[PDB]
Scaffold this active site. Structure first.
Site, PDB file in Angstrom:
ATOM      1  N   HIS A 147      49.540 -14.848  23.278  1.00  0.00           N
ATOM      2  CA  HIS A 147      49.378 -15.651  22.078  1.00  0.00           C
ATOM      3  C   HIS A 147      48.548 -14.930  21.023  1.00  0.00           C
ATOM      4  O   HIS A 147      48.366 -15.471  19.922  1.00  0.00           O
ATOM      5  CB  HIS A 147      48.785 -17.018  22.419  1.00  0.00           C
ATOM      6  N   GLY A 189      37.810 -16.453  21.141  1.00  0.00           N
ATOM      7  CA  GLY A 189      37.680 -15.025  21.306  1.00  0.00           C
ATOM      8  C   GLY A 189      37.521 -14.550  22.740  1.00  0.00           C
ATOM      9  O   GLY A 189      37.541 -13.333  22.975  1.00  0.00           O
ATOM     10  N   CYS A 224      39.551 -15.159  25.291  1.00  0.00           N
ATOM     11  CA  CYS A 224      40.819 -14.951  25.970  1.00  0.00           C
ATOM     12  C   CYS A 224      41.037 -13.461  26.241  1.00  0.00           C
ATOM     13  O   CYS A 224      40.626 -12.590  25.467  1.00  0.00           O
ATOM     14  CB  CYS A 224      41.966 -15.527  25.139  1.00  0.00           C
TER      15      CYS A 224
END
Ligand SMILES: *C(=O)[C@H](C[C@@H]1CCNC1=O)NC(=O)[C@H](CC(C)C)NC(=O)OC[C@@H]1C[C@H]1c1ccccc1
Ligand SMILES: *C(=O)[C@H](C[C@@H]1CCNC1=O)NC(=O)[C@H](CC(C)C)NC(=O)OC[C@@H]1C[C@H]1c1ccccc1
Lengths: 295, 301
Positions: B39, B141, B143
Site C-alpha cells: 500500500h 509510518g 508499516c
C-alpha cells in the site's frame, strides 16, 4: 502502547567475554579498553569478603582472557577504578559507537542488553528505582551486562550489572565503577531502603493511556499541587513538584488535559482503585521522555 | 523474569526507507531485494478500496525512493507477491544475515523492530493472538516493520506490519505477503474474531514464577485434562491437549511440579481470582510467554 527497549545493535558490537581463573563474565569493549566488574578476579572463597587491592596484585595481564568471537585480544594494561576493571587491549574496537558515560538519576529508565559469555541473549527496559535497584532478569554469568540509552547515534552507557539482592532485585554501577545506592560488591545480604512510587511517571503513563484510547479515568473534578501531595504522601508516591509539572508540560499540550486535571484522576484512582492500557496496576516505569518517544 | 526481545542488531542493518509519492514506510533489504507493504503505492483516495494491480501498472522504478542510511539504492525492478511489494535494487545488502521466511502459529511469540523512516526506534515482544492479531505499538509510518525470531544464527522473519484494526490491535502478513487472519489491506472496518487466552503459555508463566520464588498459588490438588478443559472453556481459555502437556514437560521436570498439578492451580486461580496477591509482580495472568520463551530466559540461551 508497549514497554520498549532501544535497538541494541550498537551495544552488541561492544560485548566481549572476559575470563579470569574459573570466573567468566561480560566486558564492554570501547576503543582500546574493556570495562568489566572487578569481582571477575575473585574465586569461590574470596567472594564472601574480598580484598580487591590484594587480589588484583596477584593477577598479571596474562591472567585475563578477553575474547571477541573467535578472536583473543591481548591485554596490555589493567587498572582498578572503584568497582570496575579497565583492561587496556592492543586493539581498538572498530565497532565503537559514539558514546558517553553518564550516571542516571532514580526514576530514569534505560535498556539492558543481558549477555552471557560475551553474547547477547535479550533486551528489555528497566527503571532505576528511588532506592537505586532495578527489577531485572539476570542469571549467573550476566555480570558485565550494561544499561544504556540512545540519543541520536550516541550511546549513553549508564549501568553495569554486579549483583542480586535477597529480595531478588538487582544492583550495579555506573561505568566509572560507582555503585548506585548503598551497595558493595561482596556476597553478603544487603537491604535496599524502603522504595517509593515515581509519581511523574504514573502521570505520563496516564497520558499514554489517554493518547491510546483509555479515557474512563478522566473526570470533571480538579485538584491543587499541595492537595494532591497529601494523597500521594499517604500512598507512598513521590511528592510532585512544579519541575515535574513542567516536565509533563508537553504531554499536557498534545492532549489538552492540564497536568492538575490528570492529578485529579490519579487521586481518585489512588483512593478508589477495569484496566488502563490493559494493566490492573498503575505503571510507574515510563518517563515522560519515554511516553513522548513512543507517541 | 522479564518480557524480553531478541537482540535486534542483525535486523537493524536490513531496515531501509521506502518512499513512493507522499507515502513513506519501511522496507526490509535482504540480498538485492527490498520487501515492503504494497500500500506504499496508494494515495489518499486509493486507501478506501484500491485496485493494486492497476495502481502498480501505473508506477515505474523511478517512482520508488529507497534510502539506506545516507545512500540512495537504485531500484531496478518491481514485482507484487500477494500483499507485499518486492523491489530489486542495484546493490546487495552486505549486512544480510543468514535468514529464513516462516509463517508462525498463533500462540507463538516474536520480537518486533519498530521503525520509522527506515530507522529503528525500539524493540519489544509480541504474541500472535489466537485470532491472528497482535497487540503492538505502531504509529503512522511504522508499516514495513518486521517481527522475527533468532534460532541458531538464523533470523526467521515471521511478520511484516500493515494496519490497525478498529479495536486498536494490529494485523499484518508473513514475508510472502499472506495476511495472518481474515484481513485485507484496505481502509475499512474489519472484524477479528473473539480472542482466547493462550493456556499453555499461561502455564509456562506460572512455572516461571515458581522458578523465581512466587509459590503462594500452588496447592496439593491435581486434575484431568478433561476436567481442566471444562473450566478453561468457561473462562475463554484455549483447551489443553496432551501435546501442550509434553511441551511443558521440561519445565515440569525442572520444578518437579506435574503439569496437571499446575493445571489444578490455574483452575483455582480462574474460579477464585488472585485474592489481591500478585504473581511475578502482575495483578493479571500473562499469556505471551511460550514454554520456549521461559526456558531460553531461565537458562540463558
Ligand atoms: C554476575 O557475576 C553475578 C550475577 C548474579 C548471579 C545471580 N543473580 C545475579 O544477578 N553476580 C554475583 O553473583 C555477585 C558477586 C559478588 C557481589 C562480587 N553475588 C551475588 O549476586 O549474590 C546473590 C545474593 C547475595 C545473595 C544473598 C541472598 C539472601 C541472603 C543472603 C545473601
Ligand atoms: C502503516 O503505513 C500504517 C500503520 C497504521 C496507521 C495507524 N496505526 C497503525 O498501525 N497502515 C495504515 O494506515 C493502513 C493502510 C491501508 C490498509 C491501505 N490503514 C489503517 O491502518 O487504518 C486504521 C484503522 C482501520 C481504521 C478503521 C477504524 C474504525 C472503523 C473503520 C476503519
Amino acid at each position: 502502547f508497549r514497554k520498549m527497549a532501544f535497538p541494541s545493535g550498537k551495544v552488541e558490537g561492544c560485548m566481549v567475554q572476559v575470563t579470569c581463573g574459573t570466573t567468566t563474565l561480560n566486558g564492554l569493549w570501547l576503543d582500546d579498553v574493556v570495562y568489566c566488574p572487578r569481582h571477575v578476579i575473585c574465586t569461590s572463597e574470596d567472594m564472601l569478603n574480598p580484598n580487591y587491592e590484594d587480589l588484583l596484585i596477584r593477577k598479571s595481564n596474562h591472567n585475563f582472557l578477553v575474547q571477541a568471537g573467535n578472536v583473543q585480544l591481548r591485554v596490555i594494561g589493567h587498572s582498578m577504578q572503584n568497582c570496575v576493571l579497565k583492561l587496556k587491549v592492543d586493539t581498538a574496537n572498530p565497532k565503537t559507537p559514539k558514546y558517553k558515560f553518564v550516571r542516571i538519576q532514580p526514576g530514569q529508565t534505560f535498556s539492558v542488553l543481558a549477555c552471557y559469555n560475551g553474547s547477547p541473549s535479550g533486551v528489555y527496559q528497566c527503571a532505576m528505582r528511588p532506592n537505586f535497584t532495578i527489577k531485572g532478569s539476570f542469571l549467573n554469568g550476566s555480570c558485565g551486562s550494561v544499561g544504556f540509552n540512545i540519543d541520536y547515534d550516541c550511546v549513553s552507557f549508564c549501568y553495569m550489572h554486579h549483583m542480586e539482592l535477597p529480595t531478588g532485585v538487582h544492583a550495579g554501577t555506573d561505568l566509572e565503577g560507582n555503585f548506585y545506592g548503598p551497595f558493595v560488591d561482596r556476597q553478603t545480604a544487603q537491604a535496599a531502603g524502603t522504595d517509593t512510587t515515581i509519581t511523574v511517571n504514573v502521570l505520563a503513563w496516564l497520558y499514554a493511556a489517554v493518547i491510546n484510547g483509555d479515557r474512563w479515568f478522566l473526570n470533571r473534578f480538579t485538584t491543587t499541587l499541595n492537595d494532591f501531595n497529601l494523597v500521594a504522601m499517604k500512598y507512598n508516591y513521590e511528592p510532585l513538584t512544579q519541575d515535574h509539572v513542567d516536565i509533563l508540560g508537553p504531554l499536557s499540550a498534545q492532549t489538552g488535559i492540564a497536568v492538575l486535571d490528570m492529578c485529579a484522576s490519579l487521586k481518585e484512582l489512588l483512593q478508589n482503585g477495569r484496566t488502563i492500557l490493559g494493566s490492573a496496576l498503575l505503571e510507574d516505569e515510563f518517563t515522560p521522555f519515554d511516553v513522548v518517544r513512543q507517541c
